[PDB]
Design a protein around this ligand. Structure first.
Ligand SMILES: CC(=O)N[C@H]1[C@H](O[C@@H]2[C@@H](O)[C@H](O)O[C@H](CO)[C@@H]2O)O[C@H](CO)[C@@H](O[C@@H]2O[C@H](CO[C@]3(C(=O)O)C[C@H](O)[C@@H](NC(C)=O)[C@H]([C@H](O)[C@H](O)CO)O3)[C@H](O)[C@H](O)[C@H]2O)[C@@H]1O
Ligand SMILES: CC(=O)N[C@@H]1[C@@H](O)[C@H](O[C@@H]2O[C@H](CO[C@]3(C(=O)O)C[C@H](O)[C@@H](NC(C)=O)[C@H]([C@H](O)[C@H](O)CO)O3)[C@H](O)[C@H](O)[C@H]2O)[C@@H](CO)O[C@H]1O
Ligand SMILES: CC(=O)N[C@@H]1[C@@H](O)[C@H](O[C@@H]2O[C@H](CO[C@]3(C(=O)O)C[C@H](O)[C@@H](NC(C)=O)[C@H]([C@H](O)[C@H](O)CO)O3)[C@H](O)[C@H](O)[C@H]2O)[C@@H](CO)O[C@H]1O
Ligand SMILES: *[C@@H]1O[C@H](CO)[C@@H](O[C@@H]2O[C@H](CO)[C@@H](O)[C@H](O)[C@H]2NC(C)=O)[C@H](O)[C@H]1NC(C)=O
Ligand SMILES: *[C@@H]1O[C@H](CO)[C@@H](O[C@@H]2O[C@H](CO)[C@@H](O)[C@H](O)[C@H]2NC(C)=O)[C@H](O)[C@H]1NC(C)=O
Ligand code: NAG
Ligand code: NAG
Ligand code: NAG
Ligand code: NAG
Ligand code: NAG
Ligand code: NAG
Lengths: 490, 490, 490
């Protein structure tokens, strides 16, 4: 007749890591790392992204004739740009402050293209010959569609003076440019006037552009260049243009109607007619996990990114330090299904495994609260944001990279170290709960049984099946059976 | 006759937190998080801040007529600017490198304004007509006070050639500007010469400015603009000006006399006739706490800033795992008052509580060192710093924000998780102490007493007051009571 | 007859620190902090650094005559520049985008200088008179060696139009400049033409420079100035120059022939004819430690930098929580040399110390895995990178300093805290191992021996050497001796 104290065992092969031991097989564990993605671009909470295909942001905004698909865009959730878009600037040149514009686009969800300067507004200039073979449409020379390349009419280019007063209640993004002619003859053939300028003024802009007539290398078959500029025209302000040549004038502008969180994503994976709450450039995530290792650059409600390949929290015991688990109790009980700790009883009346629901719920509550506390502390982590730099901005670009990679390393260490330390603490917690139950039965039985040291108490007397129950309840009468044990001794 | 091992209990209501359990009621605790402020701006270590009221830094340095109170400014400890000061550049335009200038002022505590170019130096130019209705003073057109808007005199504007040599040993801040006229007629009416320039040279400066005569929107009633510039003139260098018009000459310049720690605080909170060692834009801090959650931007000897709402360290024990505290000892004793651990005796002469000074003093040292160690580990933390950016520096501004918020989240997690883990260890430390003291007494008594299971030992022999003390003294003589206890065992 | 449990003791004075206690003398300990350096500059894996001595990067690349030593530099590992080099721009002026050029250079291991435009390319210009006493050589006026200050010939300066196509298959760094003359007479005396320009154009570059003819302060005896500019001509692109004066033409250019890891170190420390794998501006490191506190800016396979003065890991035991070590055992054993824990026996055959191999090995494996896990987690620490900023870039310079200092503080805290926390656990780990060993012999001997409480068990029977061994072996035969012990009892 004997009562035993033991712990759960099963056939779980899930492993966890600790500071002192790797690949410790536990009865119960919880993965906290998401490692899977649907491999496709999806709508973000019902709203489709804007996929520019082979067109860049500059080709869309200025109206590269190969980008007609986006002459009018519905509202987007985010913008997808392929890494090296073919249709960028059909006519060689530049777009000033291009990275500051992209940063501004990242906080905009909808444009409305409005005509602000009709071509009828230029009665004394030519508005139909401003085309180039560098900007082909259907094999024929063309140009950007949102601006107009004005040239001379009847061998004259009168001085332009025009003002647009923004009458909408939303800000307007407006683009214009300057053409850099190739030589003094071409300068005259196009604009007649040999010494030209472009003036642009608002309440804050005070720009003067002068053509640079020089020899340059051919790009897209052209030695000329076009330098484009942009501004944000505030609701009740006006923009004033003055030019005697080389003016690429605004025709259409963009009314910024919806502002909100967005990003310009560099991805080439295809749209998949799906919805998600979390998008990465490699694919969407559907997960309640607190961590993921898919990609740093995400948008939406996402898990926290880590470079970890494994993040598994030990919730259960060591499968088959305080000296109980794998100590004087050498192995787990597979026949014990309910509860994490309990007793095995043996007498003439019967035999069976009985769980200690009191000690078990204490352990489940603590183990569960630890998992919740761990998840809660990682709500506020560093999240990378898309910042673009140009070729003479390589120091701040490198500072950016080192900062974003720095924080990511800090949080990767924080997540992996916390799991290791608390896994160790959790295993030691189960070991302590078993010994406290072994000491609960002891100091209650006393010399009514000999403690064999294997976790069992060999009763010198005999126990009813209800006798074993009373100790499991926590109340047991030592004097009632004190007499039978003395005779059994010797 | 018995002796019991037990621990402290009081009417404390303080709650601390651990990884497994929230809201644990302990007997003693140490809050480390200051959460209150006086809601006012104050002097810093006896030095008043420079409150610019509604004047910008630009308005003070150039000398907006609305800023005349700041003509002579005493030494300051920090500068207070409203978020949108209304007295800023009364004549529209810009101040070049204004954020870089604000950055220099953050390391400056006092200027000495000096007259470097008197109006008598302009005998062939008009010095009393450079006024505008955009810069009103007392119901008449006026102008910035520290610069001079020079005009043609007798319908002439002879070329200016002037040098100022810094003969002071202090660095000199000098400001000048250019006026952009509105059309060719106004250019003649103001400065007879139609084609003008400003040249400015030092040992490192080589600047040429040319007015931009174009049409702009009216701001503060003016379609003109004034662009201002600045430089620091080293102690033996000279600045050389040449101009045939549109020149806004210096008159007064600022000698940097005191360099040190200061900040451009942004706040509209009022001055409260107070002194502090620690100042935030929402209020001043008077605390010895190691942490605060008032505001990231502080100046002076301040606590470390965290986003936490609660940061309370456990120092005492759980109020009313090794298995003693709330284990076989069901609860603490209110009647034990001079220590955390001790004994309760009961004999024929009476009863009473006694604290074990040895074990309580060891636990006090360990708990105090843990508190001190945690404060010391938090000595070096991220300190947010005011850095300013303009409308086309939003990428770097966004970089700055994410870095300062990212370090804040890292150190907030560190503070909170360390308090959680160390609070758990502290409670288990108290529980272990009590078990080791229980075993210490169990070691002396052996079979001369009985282990009840609740922390008490029922003596088999008679133990008077001197014998009770010997068990507390650690000098219990077992052989002196051997036979009586053996007789009582029957 | 008697068997004791106890633990190792030695003559160690090594001390570790814990959260609750500092300066704990432990039996064995592992330093993880490197604190020493040879105070010299060395080759990096057999490659000698480029030591510019008193020449700046600008003086080297432009070819300041006082830098001739660096006319043909072999491949380097890192570049060493003094903090304030004396031979910088001998003719005063600037090098544009200098900090960005230094950032490109920090990723370059070898230049091959080539002659791209020889002086024969200038038949109608004077090529021997472009010298200055600001750039002495051998007591006579000279000039930068890689660039040609062209001058009028026969009182004429024909317009220069030249193109260079990069026919090499590697990137080409090209430099050029513009001379700002001092007045209209000097302009004519040097270039005949009063109104001059320089145009430069590539596939991406479209630059126009115009002399600024103004009064400036004398620097190195010159009121004039030279502004220099650079570009990277890609392997099949062309650069086009046009000018009618003030042009400082390229002569030699630098082919980028090896790209690689490198850095521009600021140091006055001497080369010492040494080799290293890890270099620091104050000295070289020869070390296998995982952490060092020498300097944040290193190059090579280096330890991770912290601000700590001490980082020592407890690997062994407290020297002479669970209540065994310095508890009921109360002291270590000097006679016990072959393990951390074990037994001292005493019988009629003699006495002697013996170690428990199993419990010692289990502790050796755990502590070794602890040390390795701590080192492994700190492999991805922040690595500071040298980044230079000019006088009007003080905001981003401060942002940079704060970021690198903030990560340094974060990772210093992580190291000190993890060493503190794991040290405390390790000492407890040993305490628990001793107790579990003590309780292993207990529960096996049972009432066949008496429990002294000082760690020893007094046998009530005769335990010969094999009986003593069976206790260490775990094969004690309880029934064989039971009657002899009950006979000795009472
Ligand atoms: C072109 C030139 O040498 N100008 C010097 C000027 O000579 C003029 C003369 O050519 C003309 O015929 O007559 C007028 C008067 O009607 C002038 O006399 O005379 C100045 C003084 O009167 C010179 O200034 C002295 O220049 C010094 C520096 O000498 C160097 C130098 O070492 O940098 C001499 C070099 O040969 C010369 N470089 C070249 C390529 O010709 C340079 C060059 O002139 C400057 O670097 C360009 O700014 O100057 C000292 O600066 C001294 O203080 C100053 O008086 C004119 O240099
Ligand atoms: C009007 C015209 O065609 N003038 C002759 C040039 O065509 C010719 O230079 C050639 O130009 C080629 C590109 O031709 C376009 C273009 O960019 O596609 C055609 C456009 O009609 C024209 N646009 C305007 C407003 O005139 C455009 C324009 O002239 C340039 O873009 C201005 O920079 O050129 C191609 O580049 C060839 O390589 C080139 O030879 C020149 C020289 O032969 O003579 C002109 O009469
Ligand atoms: C063209 C000209 O030189 N003068 C007269 C115009 O100034 C005037 O335009 C009006 O000017 C108004 C503001 O008038 C001031 C001002 O800024 O307050 C008055 C100043 O005395 C004058 N300053 C100087 C130094 O001469 C100032 C100055 O001309 C401008 O700043 C130069 O930019 O103008 C106000 O803006 C009105 O809305 C504007 O019409 C016209 C019309 O009255 O007559 C001109 O002769
Ligand atoms: C821990 O203690 C705090 C109270 O000090 C509890 O916070 C309040 O809980 C009630 C609902 O139970 C809310 O209505 C209050 O708004 C909470 N905040 C207060 C009073 O400041 C908290 O819920 C407790 N947490 C647990 C797990 O028991
Ligand atoms: C500003 O004033 C000082 C004092 O006159 C000038 O420095 C002196 O210049 C003269 C002639 O060049 C020398 O003889 C003195 O030895 C110089 N004294 C000192 C302390 O430098 C200085 O040249 C002037 N600064 C400028 C840019 O002209
Ligand atoms: C832990 O388990 C995985 C998969 O079985 C294995 O790849 C890995 O090598 C194991 N780690 C160790 C230390 O054995
Ligand atoms: C644009 O029109 C509105 C309405 O009259 C007017 O208030 C405003 O001043 C105009 N803005 C400019 C820059 O002319
Ligand atoms: C607890 O006891 C102290 C002293 O008796 C008393 O000052 C205090 O008010 C009490 N606190 C509470 C919450 O009752
Ligand atoms: C401590 O013991 C070791 C073993 O011989 C010895 O090498 C060392 O020098 C000793 N140190 C002192 C201070 O005795
Ligand atoms: C620890 O040891 C060092 C060197 O012996 C000593 O400087 C320091 O004062 C000691 N610290 C404490 C708390 O005793
Ligand atoms: C340089 O020479 C090659 C020869 O193939 C030519 O293809 C190339 O276009 C030239 N580069 C320029 C900018 O003309």
């Amino acid at each position: 007749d004997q009562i035993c104290i033991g712990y759960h065992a099963n056939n779980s092969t899930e492993q966890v890591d600790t500071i002192m031991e790797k690949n410790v097989t536990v009865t119960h564990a919880q993965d906290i790392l998401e490692k899977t993605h649907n491999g496709k671009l999806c709508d973000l909470n019902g709203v489709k992204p804007l996929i520019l295909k082979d067109c860049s942001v500059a080709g869309w905004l200025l109206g590269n004739p190969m980008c007609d698909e986006f002459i009018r865009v519905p509202e987007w959730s985010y913008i997808v740009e392929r890494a090296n878009p073919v249709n960028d600037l059909c006519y060689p040149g530049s777009l000033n402050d291009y990275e500051e514009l992209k940063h501004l686009l990242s906080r905009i969800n909808h444009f409305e293209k409005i005509l602000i300067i009709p071509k009828s507004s230029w009665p004394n200039h030519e508005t139909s010959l401003g085309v180039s073979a560098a900007c082909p449409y259907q094999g024929a020379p063309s140009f950007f569609r949102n601006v107009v390349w004005l040239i001379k009419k009847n061998d004259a280019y009168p001085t332009i003076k025009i003002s647009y007063n923004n009458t909408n209640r939303e800000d307007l993004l407006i683009l214009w440019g300057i053409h850099h002619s190739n030589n003094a003859e071409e300068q005259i053939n196009l604009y007649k006037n040999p010494t030209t300028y472009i003036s642009v003024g608002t309440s804050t802009l005070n720009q003067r552009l002068v053509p640079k007539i020089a020899t340059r290398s051919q790009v897209n078959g052209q030695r000329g260049r076009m330098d484009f500029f942009w501004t944000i025209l505030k609701p009740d302000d006006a923009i004033h243009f003055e030019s005697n040549g080389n003016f690429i004038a605004p025709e259409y502008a963009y009314k910024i109607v919806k502002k909100g969180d967005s990003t310009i994503m560099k991805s080439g994976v295809e749209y998949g007619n799906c919805n998600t709450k979390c998008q990465t450039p490699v694919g969407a995530i559907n997960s309640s996990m607190p961590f993921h290792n898919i990609h740093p650059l995400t948008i939406g409600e996402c898990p926290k990114y880590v470079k970890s390949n494994k993040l598994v929290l030990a919730t259960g015991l060591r499968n088959s330090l305080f000296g109980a688990i794998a100590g004087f109790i050498e192995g787990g009980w597979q026949g014990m299904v309910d509860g994490w700790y309990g007793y095995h009883h043996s007498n003439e009346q019967g035999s069976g495994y009985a769980a200690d629901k009191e000690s078990t719920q204490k352990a489940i509550d603590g183990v569960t609260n630890k998992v919740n506390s761990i998840i809660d502390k990682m709500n506020t982590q560093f999240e990378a944001v898309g910042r673009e730099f140009n070729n003479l901005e390589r120091r701040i670009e490198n500072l950016n990279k080192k900062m974003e990679d720095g924080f990511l390393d800090v949080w990767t260490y924080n997540a992996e170290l916390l799991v290791l330390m608390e896994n160790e603490r959790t295993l030691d917690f189960h070991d302590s709960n078993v010994k406290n139950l072994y000491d609960k039965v002891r100091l209650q039985l006393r010399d009514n049984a000999k403690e064999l040291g294997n976790g069992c108490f060999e009763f010198y007397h005999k126990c009813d099946n209800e006798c074993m129950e009373s100790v499991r309840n926590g109340t047991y009468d030592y004097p009632q059976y004190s007499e039978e044990a003395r005779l059994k001794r010797e």
